[PDB]
Structure formats: C-alpha cells, structure tokens
PDB file of C-alpha atoms and ligand atoms in Angstrom:
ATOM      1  CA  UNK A  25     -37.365  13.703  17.498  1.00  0.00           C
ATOM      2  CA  UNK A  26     -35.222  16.284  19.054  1.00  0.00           C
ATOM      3  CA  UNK A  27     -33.441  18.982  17.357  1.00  0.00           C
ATOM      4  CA  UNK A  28     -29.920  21.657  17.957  1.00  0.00           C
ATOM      5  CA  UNK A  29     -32.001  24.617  19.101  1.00  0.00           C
ATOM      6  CA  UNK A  30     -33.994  21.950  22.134  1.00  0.00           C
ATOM      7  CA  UNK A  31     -30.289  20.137  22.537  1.00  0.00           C
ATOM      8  CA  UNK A  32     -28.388  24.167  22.693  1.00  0.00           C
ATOM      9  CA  UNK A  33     -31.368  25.243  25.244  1.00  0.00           C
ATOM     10  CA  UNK A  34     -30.511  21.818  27.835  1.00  0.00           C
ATOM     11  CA  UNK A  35     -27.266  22.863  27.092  1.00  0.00           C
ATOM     12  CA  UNK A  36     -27.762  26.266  28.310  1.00  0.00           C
ATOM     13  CA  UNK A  37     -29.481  25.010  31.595  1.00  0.00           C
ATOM     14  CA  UNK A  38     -26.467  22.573  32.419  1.00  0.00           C
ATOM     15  CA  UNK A  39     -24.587  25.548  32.221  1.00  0.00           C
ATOM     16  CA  UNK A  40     -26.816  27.348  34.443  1.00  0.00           C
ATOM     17  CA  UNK A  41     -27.220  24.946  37.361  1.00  0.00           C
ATOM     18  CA  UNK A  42     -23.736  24.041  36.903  1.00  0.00           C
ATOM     19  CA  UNK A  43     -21.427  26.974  36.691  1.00  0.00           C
ATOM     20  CA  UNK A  44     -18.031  26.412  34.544  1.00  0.00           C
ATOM     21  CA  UNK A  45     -19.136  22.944  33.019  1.00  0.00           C
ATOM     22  CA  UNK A  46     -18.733  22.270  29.175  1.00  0.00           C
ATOM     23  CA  UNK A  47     -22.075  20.145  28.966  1.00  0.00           C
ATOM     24  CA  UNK A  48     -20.744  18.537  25.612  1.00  0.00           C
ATOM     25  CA  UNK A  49     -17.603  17.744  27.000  1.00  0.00           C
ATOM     26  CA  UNK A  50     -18.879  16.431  30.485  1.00  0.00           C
ATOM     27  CA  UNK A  51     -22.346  14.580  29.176  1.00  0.00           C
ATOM     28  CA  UNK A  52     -22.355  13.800  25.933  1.00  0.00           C
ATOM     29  CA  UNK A  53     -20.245  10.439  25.911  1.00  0.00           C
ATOM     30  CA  UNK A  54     -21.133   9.419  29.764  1.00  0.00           C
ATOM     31  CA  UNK A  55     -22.652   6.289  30.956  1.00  0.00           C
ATOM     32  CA  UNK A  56     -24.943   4.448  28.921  1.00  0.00           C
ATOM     33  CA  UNK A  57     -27.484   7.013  28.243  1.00  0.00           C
ATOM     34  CA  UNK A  58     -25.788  10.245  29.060  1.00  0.00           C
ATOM     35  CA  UNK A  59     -25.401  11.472  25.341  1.00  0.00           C
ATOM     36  CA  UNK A  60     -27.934  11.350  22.177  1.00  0.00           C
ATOM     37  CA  UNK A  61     -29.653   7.586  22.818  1.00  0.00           C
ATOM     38  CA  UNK A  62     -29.025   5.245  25.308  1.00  0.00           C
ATOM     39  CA  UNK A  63     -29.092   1.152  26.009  1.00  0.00           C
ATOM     40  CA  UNK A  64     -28.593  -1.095  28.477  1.00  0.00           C
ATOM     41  CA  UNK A  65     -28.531  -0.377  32.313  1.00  0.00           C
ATOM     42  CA  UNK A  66     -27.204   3.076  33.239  1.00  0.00           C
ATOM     43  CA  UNK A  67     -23.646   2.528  35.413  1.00  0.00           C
ATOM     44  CA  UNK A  68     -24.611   5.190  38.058  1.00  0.00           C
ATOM     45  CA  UNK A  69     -26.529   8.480  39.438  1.00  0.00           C
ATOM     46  CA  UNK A  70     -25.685  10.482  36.986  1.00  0.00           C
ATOM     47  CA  UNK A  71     -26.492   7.950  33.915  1.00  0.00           C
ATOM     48  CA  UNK A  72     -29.717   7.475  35.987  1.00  0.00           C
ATOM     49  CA  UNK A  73     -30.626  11.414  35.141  1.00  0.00           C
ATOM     50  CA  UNK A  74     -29.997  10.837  31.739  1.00  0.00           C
ATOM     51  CA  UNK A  75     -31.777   7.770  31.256  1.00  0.00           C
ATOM     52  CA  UNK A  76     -34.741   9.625  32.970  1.00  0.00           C
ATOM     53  CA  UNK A  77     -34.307  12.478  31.219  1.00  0.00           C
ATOM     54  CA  UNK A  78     -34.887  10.063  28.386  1.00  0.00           C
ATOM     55  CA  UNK A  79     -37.826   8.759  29.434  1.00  0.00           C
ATOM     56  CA  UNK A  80     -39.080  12.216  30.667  1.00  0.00           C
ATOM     57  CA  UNK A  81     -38.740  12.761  26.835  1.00  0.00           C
ATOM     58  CA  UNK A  82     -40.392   9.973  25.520  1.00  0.00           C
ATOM     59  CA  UNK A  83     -43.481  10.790  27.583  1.00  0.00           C
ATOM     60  CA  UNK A  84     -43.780  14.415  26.282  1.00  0.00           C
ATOM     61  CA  UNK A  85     -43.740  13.026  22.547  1.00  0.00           C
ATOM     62  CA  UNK A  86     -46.499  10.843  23.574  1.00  0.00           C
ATOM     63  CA  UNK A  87     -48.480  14.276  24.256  1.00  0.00           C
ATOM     64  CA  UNK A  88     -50.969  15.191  22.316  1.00  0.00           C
ATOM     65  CA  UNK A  89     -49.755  19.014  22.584  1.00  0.00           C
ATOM     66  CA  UNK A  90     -46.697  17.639  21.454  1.00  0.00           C
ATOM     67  CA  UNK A  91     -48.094  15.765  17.596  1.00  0.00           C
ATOM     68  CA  UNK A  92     -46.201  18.433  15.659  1.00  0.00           C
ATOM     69  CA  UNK A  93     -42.842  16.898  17.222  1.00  0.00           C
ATOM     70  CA  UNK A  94     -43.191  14.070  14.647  1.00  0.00           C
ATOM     71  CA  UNK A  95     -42.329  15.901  11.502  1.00  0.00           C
ATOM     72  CA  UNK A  96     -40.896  19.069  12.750  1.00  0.00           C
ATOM     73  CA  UNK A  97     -38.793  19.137  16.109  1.00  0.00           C
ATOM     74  CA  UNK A  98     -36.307  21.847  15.100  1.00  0.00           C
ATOM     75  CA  UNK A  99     -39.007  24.019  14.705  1.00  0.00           C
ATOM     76  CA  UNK A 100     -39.787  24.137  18.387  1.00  0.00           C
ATOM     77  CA  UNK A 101     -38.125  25.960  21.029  1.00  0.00           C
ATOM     78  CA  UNK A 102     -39.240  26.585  25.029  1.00  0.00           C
ATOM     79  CA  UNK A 103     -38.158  29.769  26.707  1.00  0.00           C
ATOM     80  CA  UNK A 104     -36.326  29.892  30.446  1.00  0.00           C
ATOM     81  CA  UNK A 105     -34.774  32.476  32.523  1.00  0.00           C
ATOM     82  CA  UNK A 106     -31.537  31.441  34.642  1.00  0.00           C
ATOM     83  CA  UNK A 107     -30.790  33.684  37.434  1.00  0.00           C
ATOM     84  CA  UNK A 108     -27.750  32.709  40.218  1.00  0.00           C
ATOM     85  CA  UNK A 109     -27.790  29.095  38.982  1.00  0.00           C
ATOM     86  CA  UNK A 110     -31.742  29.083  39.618  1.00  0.00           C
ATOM     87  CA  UNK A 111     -33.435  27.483  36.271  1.00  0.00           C
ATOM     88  CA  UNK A 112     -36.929  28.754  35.763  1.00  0.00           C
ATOM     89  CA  UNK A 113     -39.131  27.496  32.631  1.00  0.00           C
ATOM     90  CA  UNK A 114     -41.202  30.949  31.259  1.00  0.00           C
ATOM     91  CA  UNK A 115     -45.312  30.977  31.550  1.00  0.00           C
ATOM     92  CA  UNK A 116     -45.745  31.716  28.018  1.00  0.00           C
ATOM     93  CA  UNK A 117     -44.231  27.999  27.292  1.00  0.00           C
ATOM     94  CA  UNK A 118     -47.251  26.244  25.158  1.00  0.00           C
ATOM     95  CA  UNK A 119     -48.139  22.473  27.007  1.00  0.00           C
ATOM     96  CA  UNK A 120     -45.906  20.493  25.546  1.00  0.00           C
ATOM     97  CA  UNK A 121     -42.745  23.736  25.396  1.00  0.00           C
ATOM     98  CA  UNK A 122     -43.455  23.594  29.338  1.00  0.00           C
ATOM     99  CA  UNK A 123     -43.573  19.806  29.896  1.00  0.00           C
ATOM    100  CA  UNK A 124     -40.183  19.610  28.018  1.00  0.00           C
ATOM    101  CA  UNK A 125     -38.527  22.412  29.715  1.00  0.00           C
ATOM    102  CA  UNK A 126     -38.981  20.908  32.836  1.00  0.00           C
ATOM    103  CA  UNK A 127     -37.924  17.398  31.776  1.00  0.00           C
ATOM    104  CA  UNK A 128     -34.668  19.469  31.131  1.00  0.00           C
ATOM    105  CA  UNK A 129     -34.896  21.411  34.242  1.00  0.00           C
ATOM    106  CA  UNK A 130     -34.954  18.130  36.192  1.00  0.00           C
ATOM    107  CA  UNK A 131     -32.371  16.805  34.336  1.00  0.00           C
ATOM    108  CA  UNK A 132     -29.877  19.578  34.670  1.00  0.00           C
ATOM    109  CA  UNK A 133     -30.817  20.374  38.580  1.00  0.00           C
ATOM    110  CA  UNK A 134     -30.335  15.840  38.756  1.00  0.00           C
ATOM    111  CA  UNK A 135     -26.702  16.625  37.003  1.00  0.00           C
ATOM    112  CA  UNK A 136     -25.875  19.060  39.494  1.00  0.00           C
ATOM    113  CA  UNK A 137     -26.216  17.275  42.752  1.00  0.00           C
ATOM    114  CA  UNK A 138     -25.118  13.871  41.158  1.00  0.00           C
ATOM    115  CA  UNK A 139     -21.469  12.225  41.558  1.00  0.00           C
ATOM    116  CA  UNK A 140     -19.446  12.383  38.339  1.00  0.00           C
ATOM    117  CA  UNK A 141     -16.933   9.472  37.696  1.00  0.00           C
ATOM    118  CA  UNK A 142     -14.491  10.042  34.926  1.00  0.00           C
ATOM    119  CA  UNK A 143     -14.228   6.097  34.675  1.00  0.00           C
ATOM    120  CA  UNK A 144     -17.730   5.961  33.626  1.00  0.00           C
ATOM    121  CA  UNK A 145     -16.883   8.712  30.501  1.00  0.00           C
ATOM    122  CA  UNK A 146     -16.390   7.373  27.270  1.00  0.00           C
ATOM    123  CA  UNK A 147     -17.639   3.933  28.443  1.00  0.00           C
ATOM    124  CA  UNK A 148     -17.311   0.927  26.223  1.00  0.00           C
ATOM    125  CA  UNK A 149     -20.947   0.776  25.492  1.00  0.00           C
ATOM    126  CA  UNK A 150     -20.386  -2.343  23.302  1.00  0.00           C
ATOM    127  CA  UNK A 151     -19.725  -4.301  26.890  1.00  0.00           C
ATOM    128  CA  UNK A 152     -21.249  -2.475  29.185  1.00  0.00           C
ATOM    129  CA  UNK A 153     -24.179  -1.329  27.880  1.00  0.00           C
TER     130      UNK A 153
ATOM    131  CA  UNK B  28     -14.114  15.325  22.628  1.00  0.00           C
ATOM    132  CA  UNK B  29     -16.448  13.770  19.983  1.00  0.00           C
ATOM    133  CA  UNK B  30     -17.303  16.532  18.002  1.00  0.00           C
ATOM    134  CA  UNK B  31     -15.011  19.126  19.457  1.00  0.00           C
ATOM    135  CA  UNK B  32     -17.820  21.265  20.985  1.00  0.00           C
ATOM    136  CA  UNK B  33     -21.457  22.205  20.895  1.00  0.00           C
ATOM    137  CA  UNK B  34     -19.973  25.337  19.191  1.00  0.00           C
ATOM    138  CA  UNK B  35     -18.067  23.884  16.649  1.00  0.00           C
ATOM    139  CA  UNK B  36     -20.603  21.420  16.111  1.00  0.00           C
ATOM    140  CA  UNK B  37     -22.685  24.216  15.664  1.00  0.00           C
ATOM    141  CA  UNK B  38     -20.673  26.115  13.088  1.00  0.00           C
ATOM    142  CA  UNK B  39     -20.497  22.865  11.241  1.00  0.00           C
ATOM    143  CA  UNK B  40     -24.568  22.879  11.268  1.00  0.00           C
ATOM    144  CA  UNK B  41     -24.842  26.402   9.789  1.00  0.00           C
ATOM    145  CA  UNK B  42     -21.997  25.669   6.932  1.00  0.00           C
ATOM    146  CA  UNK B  43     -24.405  21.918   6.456  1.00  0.00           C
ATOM    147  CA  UNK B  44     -27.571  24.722   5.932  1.00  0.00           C
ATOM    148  CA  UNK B  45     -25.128  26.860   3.615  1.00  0.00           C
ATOM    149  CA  UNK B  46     -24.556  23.578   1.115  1.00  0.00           C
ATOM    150  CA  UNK B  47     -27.833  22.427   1.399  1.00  0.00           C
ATOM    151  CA  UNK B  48     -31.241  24.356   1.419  1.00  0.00           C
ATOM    152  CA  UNK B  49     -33.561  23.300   3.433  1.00  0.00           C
ATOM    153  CA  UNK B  50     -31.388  20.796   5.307  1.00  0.00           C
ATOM    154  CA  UNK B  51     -32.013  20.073   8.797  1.00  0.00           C
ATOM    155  CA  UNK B  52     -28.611  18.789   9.796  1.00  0.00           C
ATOM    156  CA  UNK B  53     -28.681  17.120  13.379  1.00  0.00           C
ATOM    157  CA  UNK B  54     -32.020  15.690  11.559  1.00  0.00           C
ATOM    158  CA  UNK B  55     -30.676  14.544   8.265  1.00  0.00           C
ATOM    159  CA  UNK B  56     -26.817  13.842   9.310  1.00  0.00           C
ATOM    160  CA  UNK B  57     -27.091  12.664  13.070  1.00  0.00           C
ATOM    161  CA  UNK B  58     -27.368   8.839  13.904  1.00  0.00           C
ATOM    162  CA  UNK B  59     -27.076   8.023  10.189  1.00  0.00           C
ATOM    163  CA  UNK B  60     -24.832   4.485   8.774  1.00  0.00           C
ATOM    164  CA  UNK B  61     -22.213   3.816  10.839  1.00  0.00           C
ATOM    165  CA  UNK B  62     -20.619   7.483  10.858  1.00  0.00           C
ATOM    166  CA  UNK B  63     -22.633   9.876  10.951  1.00  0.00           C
ATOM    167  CA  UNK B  64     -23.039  10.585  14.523  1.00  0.00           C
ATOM    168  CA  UNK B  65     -21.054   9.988  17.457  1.00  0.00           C
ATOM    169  CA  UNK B  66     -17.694   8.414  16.832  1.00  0.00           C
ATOM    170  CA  UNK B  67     -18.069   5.216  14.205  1.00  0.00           C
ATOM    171  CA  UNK B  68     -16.675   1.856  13.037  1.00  0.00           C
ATOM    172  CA  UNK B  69     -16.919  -1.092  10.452  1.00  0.00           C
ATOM    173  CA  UNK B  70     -17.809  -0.155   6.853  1.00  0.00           C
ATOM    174  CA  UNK B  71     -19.503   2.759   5.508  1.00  0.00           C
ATOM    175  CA  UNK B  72     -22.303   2.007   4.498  1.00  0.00           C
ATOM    176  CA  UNK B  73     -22.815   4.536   1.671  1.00  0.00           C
ATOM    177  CA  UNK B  74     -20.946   7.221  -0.028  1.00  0.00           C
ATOM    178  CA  UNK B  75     -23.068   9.673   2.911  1.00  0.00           C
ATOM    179  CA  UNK B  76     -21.221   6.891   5.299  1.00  0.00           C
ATOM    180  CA  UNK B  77     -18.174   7.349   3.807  1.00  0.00           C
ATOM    181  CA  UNK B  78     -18.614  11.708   4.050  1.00  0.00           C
ATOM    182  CA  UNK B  79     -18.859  10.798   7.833  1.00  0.00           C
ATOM    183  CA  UNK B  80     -16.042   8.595   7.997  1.00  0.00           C
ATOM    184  CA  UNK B  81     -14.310  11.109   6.188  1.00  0.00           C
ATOM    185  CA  UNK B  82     -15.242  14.487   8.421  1.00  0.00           C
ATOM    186  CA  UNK B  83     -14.737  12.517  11.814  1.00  0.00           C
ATOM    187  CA  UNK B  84     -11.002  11.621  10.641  1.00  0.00           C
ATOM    188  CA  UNK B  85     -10.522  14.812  10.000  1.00  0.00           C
ATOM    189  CA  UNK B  86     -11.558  16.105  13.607  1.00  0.00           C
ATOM    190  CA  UNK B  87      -8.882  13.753  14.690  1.00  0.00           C
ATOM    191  CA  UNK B  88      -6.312  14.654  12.787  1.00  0.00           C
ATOM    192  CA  UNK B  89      -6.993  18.165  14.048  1.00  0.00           C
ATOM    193  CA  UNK B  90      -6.610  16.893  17.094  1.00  0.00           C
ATOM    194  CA  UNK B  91      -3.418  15.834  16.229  1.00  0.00           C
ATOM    195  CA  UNK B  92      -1.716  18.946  14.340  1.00  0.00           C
ATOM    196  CA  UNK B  93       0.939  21.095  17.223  1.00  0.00           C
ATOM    197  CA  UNK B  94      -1.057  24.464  15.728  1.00  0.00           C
ATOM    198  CA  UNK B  95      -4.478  22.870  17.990  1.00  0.00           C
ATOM    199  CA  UNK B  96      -2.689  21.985  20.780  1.00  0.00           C
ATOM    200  CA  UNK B  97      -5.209  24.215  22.647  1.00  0.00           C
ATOM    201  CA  UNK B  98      -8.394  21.793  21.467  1.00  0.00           C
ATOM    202  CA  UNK B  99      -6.397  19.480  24.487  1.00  0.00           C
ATOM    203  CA  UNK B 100      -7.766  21.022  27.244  1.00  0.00           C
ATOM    204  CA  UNK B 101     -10.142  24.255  25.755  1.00  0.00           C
ATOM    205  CA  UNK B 102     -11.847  22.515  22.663  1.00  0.00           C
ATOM    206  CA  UNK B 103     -15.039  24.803  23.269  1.00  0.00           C
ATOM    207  CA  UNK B 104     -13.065  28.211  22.367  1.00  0.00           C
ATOM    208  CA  UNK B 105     -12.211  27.176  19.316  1.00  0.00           C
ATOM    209  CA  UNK B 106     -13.931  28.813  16.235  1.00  0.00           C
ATOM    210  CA  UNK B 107     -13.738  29.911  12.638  1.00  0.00           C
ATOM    211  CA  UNK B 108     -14.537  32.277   9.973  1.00  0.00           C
ATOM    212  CA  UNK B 109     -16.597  31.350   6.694  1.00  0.00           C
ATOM    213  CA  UNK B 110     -18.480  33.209   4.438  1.00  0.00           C
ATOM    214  CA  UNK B 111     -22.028  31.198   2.392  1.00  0.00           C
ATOM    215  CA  UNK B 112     -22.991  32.612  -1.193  1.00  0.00           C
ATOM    216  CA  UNK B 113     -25.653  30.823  -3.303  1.00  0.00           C
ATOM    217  CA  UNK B 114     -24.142  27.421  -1.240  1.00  0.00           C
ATOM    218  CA  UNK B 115     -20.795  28.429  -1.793  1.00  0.00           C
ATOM    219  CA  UNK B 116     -18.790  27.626   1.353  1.00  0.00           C
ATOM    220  CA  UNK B 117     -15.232  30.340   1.620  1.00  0.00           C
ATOM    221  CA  UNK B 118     -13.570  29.998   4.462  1.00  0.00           C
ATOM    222  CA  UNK B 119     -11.885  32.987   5.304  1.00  0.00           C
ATOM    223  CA  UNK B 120      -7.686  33.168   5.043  1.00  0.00           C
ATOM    224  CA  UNK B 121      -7.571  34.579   8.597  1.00  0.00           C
ATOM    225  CA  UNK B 122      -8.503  31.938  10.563  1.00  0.00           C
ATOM    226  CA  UNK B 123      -5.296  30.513  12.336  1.00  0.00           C
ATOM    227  CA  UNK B 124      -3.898  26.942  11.644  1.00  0.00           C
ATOM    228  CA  UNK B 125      -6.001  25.224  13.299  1.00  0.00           C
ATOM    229  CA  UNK B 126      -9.230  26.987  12.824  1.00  0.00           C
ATOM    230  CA  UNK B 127      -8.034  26.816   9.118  1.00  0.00           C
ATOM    231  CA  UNK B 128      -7.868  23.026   8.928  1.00  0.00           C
ATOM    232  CA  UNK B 129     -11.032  22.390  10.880  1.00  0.00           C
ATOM    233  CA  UNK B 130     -13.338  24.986   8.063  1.00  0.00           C
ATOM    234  CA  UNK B 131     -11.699  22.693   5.893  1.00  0.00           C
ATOM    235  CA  UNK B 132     -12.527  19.586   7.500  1.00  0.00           C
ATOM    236  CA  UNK B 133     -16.521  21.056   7.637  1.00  0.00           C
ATOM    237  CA  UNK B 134     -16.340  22.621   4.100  1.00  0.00           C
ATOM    238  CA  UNK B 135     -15.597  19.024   2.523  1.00  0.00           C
ATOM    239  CA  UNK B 136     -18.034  17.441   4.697  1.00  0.00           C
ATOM    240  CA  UNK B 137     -21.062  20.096   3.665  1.00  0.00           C
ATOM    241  CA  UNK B 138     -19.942  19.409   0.261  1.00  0.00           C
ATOM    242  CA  UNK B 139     -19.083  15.841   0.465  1.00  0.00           C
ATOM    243  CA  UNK B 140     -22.886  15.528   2.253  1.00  0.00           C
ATOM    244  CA  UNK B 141     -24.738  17.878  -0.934  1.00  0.00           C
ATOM    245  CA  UNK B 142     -23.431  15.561  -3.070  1.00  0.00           C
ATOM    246  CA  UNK B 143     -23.870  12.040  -1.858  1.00  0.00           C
ATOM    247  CA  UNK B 144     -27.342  10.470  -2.067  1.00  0.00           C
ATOM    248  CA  UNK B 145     -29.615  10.188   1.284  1.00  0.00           C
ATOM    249  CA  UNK B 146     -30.829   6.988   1.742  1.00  0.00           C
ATOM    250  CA  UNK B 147     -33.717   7.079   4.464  1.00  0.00           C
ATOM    251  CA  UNK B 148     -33.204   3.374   4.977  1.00  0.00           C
ATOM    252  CA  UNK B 149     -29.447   4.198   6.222  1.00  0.00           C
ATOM    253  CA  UNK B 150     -31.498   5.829   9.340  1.00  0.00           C
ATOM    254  CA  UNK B 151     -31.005   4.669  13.043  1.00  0.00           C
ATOM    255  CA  UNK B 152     -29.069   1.485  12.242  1.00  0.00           C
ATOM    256  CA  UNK B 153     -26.634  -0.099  15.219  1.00  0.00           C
ATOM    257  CA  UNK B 154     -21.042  -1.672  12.381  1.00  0.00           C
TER     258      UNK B 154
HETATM  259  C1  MJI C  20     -24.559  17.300  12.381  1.00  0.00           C
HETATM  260  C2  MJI C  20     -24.649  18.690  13.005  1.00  0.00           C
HETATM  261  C3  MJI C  20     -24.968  18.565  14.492  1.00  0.00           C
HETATM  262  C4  MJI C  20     -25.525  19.888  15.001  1.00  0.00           C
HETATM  263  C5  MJI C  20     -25.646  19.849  16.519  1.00  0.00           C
HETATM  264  C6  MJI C  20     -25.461  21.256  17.074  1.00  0.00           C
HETATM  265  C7  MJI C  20     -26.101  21.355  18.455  1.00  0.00           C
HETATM  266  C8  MJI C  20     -25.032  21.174  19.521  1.00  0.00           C
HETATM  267  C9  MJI C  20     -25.673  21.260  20.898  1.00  0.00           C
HETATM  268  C10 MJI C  20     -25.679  19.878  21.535  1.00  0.00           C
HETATM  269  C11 MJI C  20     -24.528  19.761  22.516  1.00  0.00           C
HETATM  270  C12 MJI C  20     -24.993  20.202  23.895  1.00  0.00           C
HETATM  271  C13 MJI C  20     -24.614  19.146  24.919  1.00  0.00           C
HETATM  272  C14 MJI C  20     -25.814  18.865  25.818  1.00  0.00           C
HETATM  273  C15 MJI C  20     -25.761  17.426  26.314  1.00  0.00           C
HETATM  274  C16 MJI C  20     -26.347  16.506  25.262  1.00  0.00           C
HETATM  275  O1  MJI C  20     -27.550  15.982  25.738  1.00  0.00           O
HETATM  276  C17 MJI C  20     -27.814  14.729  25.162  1.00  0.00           C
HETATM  277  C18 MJI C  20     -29.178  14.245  25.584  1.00  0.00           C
HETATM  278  C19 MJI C  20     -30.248  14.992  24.820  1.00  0.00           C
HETATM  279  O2  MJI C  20     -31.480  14.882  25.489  1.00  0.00           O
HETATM  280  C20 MJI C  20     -32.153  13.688  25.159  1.00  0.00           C
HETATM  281  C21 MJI C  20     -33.631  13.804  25.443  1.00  0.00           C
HETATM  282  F1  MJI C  20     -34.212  12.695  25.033  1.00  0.00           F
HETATM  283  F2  MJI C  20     -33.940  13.929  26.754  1.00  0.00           F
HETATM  284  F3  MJI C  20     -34.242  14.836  24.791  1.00  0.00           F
HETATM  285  O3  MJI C  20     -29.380  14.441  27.006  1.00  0.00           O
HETATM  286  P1  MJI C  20     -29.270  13.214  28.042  1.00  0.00           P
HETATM  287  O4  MJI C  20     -29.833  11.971  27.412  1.00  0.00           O
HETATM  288  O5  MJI C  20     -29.799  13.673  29.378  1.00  0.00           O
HETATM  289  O6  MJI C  20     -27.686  13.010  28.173  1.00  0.00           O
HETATM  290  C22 MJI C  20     -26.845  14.056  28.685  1.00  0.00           C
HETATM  291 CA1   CA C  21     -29.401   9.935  26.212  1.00  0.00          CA
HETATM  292 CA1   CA C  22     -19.110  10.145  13.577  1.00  0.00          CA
END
C-alpha cells in the first residue's frame, strides 16, 4: 500500500534532516526492516526507526481517512516544507496526508540522531532476520 | 546499490508507464516472484520472473563495464536520455556508455514486462 511519489517524499525528508545522505543508498538494504518490508527482530537503533516507521504505517492504513489507500496509494501525496534541516508537515495535509507525513517526519528526524553501522547494511536477512 | 538509485529507479518507472498505459510500476512490478523487487534468487517463477531476473543482471553487469566506473562511489548522478511515442521506448544516441547500456537494460525490461503475462497470484511471495 505505498507508492514512488509517498516513498520520493520520505526520501526527500531523509535528505532534509540529514544533509548529504543518499537515502536509497544508506536505508534501503539496512537491518531487517530498513528498506521496503521487514521480518524478524531489527539488529539496532536505526532498524528500530524503520521497523516503527513500519508500524507507524500500518496504523495510518487502519484509518478510516485513510480507506482510499487500499486501491489507490500512488494517487496520494502529503505536502512539507524543509527549511535548515527543520522538517515541517503543511496544514492543508487531509487526516490521513498529515498522520503519514509525520510517521515520516519521525522516521527521518529517528534516522538522524541514530548510530549507523555499515556491518548491519546489506544484512543476510535469510539468518538474521 | 540495489537498484542504482531512487533516480534511476525512477527513470526506469516513467519508461515502465511509457510501455504500459495505465501501469503503476512500484505497484505492479515491486515485490513480485522471486525478482521483481529487491535483489532475487532460485527460479523465476514466470516469464514476468524471468523479465526481473533479466533487468537486475543487467544492473550488474553495468556495474561491471570500466565506462560506469563512476556508479562505484556516485550511483545517484547517473542518468539517461529516452524519448516515449505511442509506447515506443528510443533511447537517445547521446547518452554516454554507460548511461547507454543502462536505457538499454530498462528499455528491454519495459518491453520484456508489456509483454509477459501478470499473474496476481505471483504477488508478495517469500525462492
Ligand atoms: C519498479 C519501479 C520502482 C519505482 C520506484 C521509484 C521510487 C524511488 C524512491 C524510493 C527510494 C527512496 C529511498 C527511501 C528509503 C526507502 O524507504 C523504505 C521504507 C518505506 O517506508 C515504509 C513505510 F511502511 F513506512 F511506509 O522505509 P523504512 O521501512 O523506514 O526503511 C528505510
Ligand atoms: Ca521497512
Ligand atoms: Ca530484483
């Protein structure tokens, strides 16, 4: 349930809280949740803000502002404004626009202040997750 | 890595859109068989699968050619020129090397994926 304009717009927050990173690069094969999915037991603080990030997720699809995710999540898009590093999700965000934003606020801010351990990148998830 | 970059994988989305009308590509071609997706192993599962298998050894050998040597280290400034008429995928003869070989490695793949059937019950599998 999640689509290239949501995953380009976390994207664009990562890069905003966390100046010169190459979110696809740094978090899409990290852990055991940091990526699209997740299983297992995350490995450390940083899988822990993905897997909640996750979860964050799953609780906005259970919204009932959020029923038209079901069939069409491409075709919804929240707006934010990023201003030295500071992520801010915009007022005219519908209910479930601004409950997702800031499941991807958290999640980028959680990214910034967490440790990152290249061992942990590219994990065998087939043993360790 | 896996997909070069959000860029590239982006570029490979609109070319997907170009092939097929009204496709919805992460959608339709993300966590699909044992390919399509992130990385991949065992035996495709369908002739889709096998599109997958295909495009993601092509991203390797990219990897692999001297002329991207610069993926190594800067894989997010690479990008390519392509043209889209009636589906048509072009891509354009003044892209460098290795922008060259990776249109080509997307323009199979959209065609490869317009052509093979979808079956639904290939969806969110485990290979
Ligand atoms: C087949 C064509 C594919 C088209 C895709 C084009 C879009 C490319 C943009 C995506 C790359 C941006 C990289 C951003 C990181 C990926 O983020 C992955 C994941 C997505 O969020 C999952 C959620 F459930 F929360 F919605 O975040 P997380 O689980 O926190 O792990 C980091
Ligand atoms: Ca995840
Ligand atoms: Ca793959």
């Amino acid at each position: 349930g999640i689509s290239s304009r949501a995953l380009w717009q976390f994207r664009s927050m990562i890069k905003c809280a966390i100046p010169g990173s190459h979110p696809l690069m740094d978090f899409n094969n990290y852990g055991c949740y940091c990526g699209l999915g997740g299983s297992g037991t995350p490995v450390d603080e940083l899988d822990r803000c993905c897997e909640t990030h996750d979860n964050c997720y799953r609780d906005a699809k259970n919204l009932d502002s959020c029923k038209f995710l079901v069939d069409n999540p491409y075709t919804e898009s929240y707006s934010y404004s990023c201003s030295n590093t500071e992520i801010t999700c915009n007022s005219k965000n519908n209910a479930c626009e601004a409950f997702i934003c800031n499941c991807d606020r958290n999640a980028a801010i959680c990214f910034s202040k967490a440790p990152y351990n290249k061992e942990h990148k590219n994990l065998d998830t087939k043993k360790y997750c």
